[PDB]
Amino acid sequence: XXXXXXXXXXXXXXXXXXXXXLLSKQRRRAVV
């Protein structure tokens, strides 16, 4: 039952890693 625990730990580590991981001057006043 060590393989399931290792897989769970690896999944937790992967989840933790995934969680851790032009304009104008006329356009200044034309849009306003």
Burial class from Cβ neighbours inside 10 Å (0-12, 13-18, 19+) for residue 5 reads: exposed
User: Running DSSP on this structure, what letter comes out for residue 26?
Assistant: T
Residue 22 and residue 11: Cα distance in Å, rounded? 44
Q: How far is CA 31 from its chain centroid?
A: 34
Q: Tokens 């730990």, residue? A: 9
Residue 1 and residue 8: Cα distance in Å, rounded? 11
Phi-psi group of 24: left, alpha or beta (phi > 0 → left; psi -120 to 50 → alpha; rest → beta):
beta
**φ, ψ for residue 24, nearest 5 deg:** -90, -170
Sign of the Cα pseudo-torsion (7, 13, 15, 18, in order) = negative
Q: How far is CA 32 from CA 12, 13, 21, 26, 27, in A?
A: 50, 50, 38, 10, 8
Token pair in block for residue 24: 């104008």
